[PDB]
Design an enzyme around this catalytic site. Sequence first.
Site, PDB file in Angstrom:
ATOM      1  CG  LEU A  99      -0.485   0.135   2.630  1.00 23.04           C
ATOM      2  CD1 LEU A  99      -1.455   0.355   3.607  1.00 23.04           C
ATOM      3  CD2 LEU A  99       0.422  -1.077   3.134  1.00 23.04           C
ATOM      4  CB  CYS A 100       1.402   3.961   1.327  1.00 20.64           C
ATOM      5  SG  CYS A 100       2.471   5.563   1.784  1.00 20.64           S
ATOM      6  CG  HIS A 101       4.944   6.310  -1.463  1.00 20.78           C
ATOM      7  ND1 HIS A 101       3.964   6.851  -0.365  1.00 20.78           N
ATOM      8  CD2 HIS A 101       5.272   7.098  -2.418  1.00 20.78           C
ATOM      9  CE1 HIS A 101       3.869   8.127  -0.959  1.00 20.78           C
ATOM     10  NE2 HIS A 101       4.516   8.282  -2.025  1.00 20.78           N
ATOM     11  N   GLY A 132      -3.312  -0.981  -1.115  1.00 18.89           N
ATOM     12  CA  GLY A 132      -3.937  -0.094  -0.752  1.00 18.89           C
ATOM     13  C   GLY A 132      -3.607   1.530  -1.264  1.00 18.89           C
TER      14      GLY A 132
END
Length: 281
Positions: free
Chosen positions: A183-185, A258
């Site tokens: 998720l995210c980075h 995500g």
Amino acid sequence: MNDKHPTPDPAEDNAFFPSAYSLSQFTASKSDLSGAHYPTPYQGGRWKILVVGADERYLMMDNGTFFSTGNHPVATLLPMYHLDKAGFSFDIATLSGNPVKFEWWAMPREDQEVNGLYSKYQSSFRQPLKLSDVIETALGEDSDYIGVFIPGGHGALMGLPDSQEVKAVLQWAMKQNKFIISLCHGPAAFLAVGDDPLFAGYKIVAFPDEMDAQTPSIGYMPGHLTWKFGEQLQAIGFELLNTGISGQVFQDRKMLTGDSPLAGNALGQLAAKALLAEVEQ
């Protein structure tokens, strides 16, 4: 709670925690951890999940400053919370074997459950396995890993996106049809495959390049990113589903992603269901 200046990080020269203002916008004392109750856990006691953490806290900005980052504890601990509750265990590894670096400024200090989970795994975070050793004898066709977890935070932008060992883990994952969760980075790590079109057509959410472009204005980072992981993923056949963040998640086959740290809880629910449903296949 008003100051938008990057807050100096005392441990490192010319390195900055997020500004007081940004912190008050992007962090909270408690997480939105919820729905982590699974009446029918996995008790098979075999399946573990490989966690590939960030070993570096200091990310070099375009203006020469270090952003004091790491893995985002909400993007990290919340998916781990659901999977822990759903029956699964973890091995924790970094590229160097050096301790996993958290963005402790994003830790929810009043969250008993999350604080609890971290403490259960603290010895592993503080002294993790070295990925190269995991890769030697812990993968292959007989692996006890049912999936790979690559938590987010800008700390994921370092080492992982061109590690040939992250490459081997991703190729293993795809070849043996295992879960890849990020998720995210975190998804910046999928870039380790180089020019292997392994991922062509895959649909993922991730942190928007455009948001990274705006957050230094409130002093969240002390400069701008030297490169854009979203577009570069786009260049290797990834379809990016999201222009904004709502903490939503998406699953394409065994690829579970995500959109941001906010997607922490949801990723945990999505991954828990997928893994629980497969050890009952």
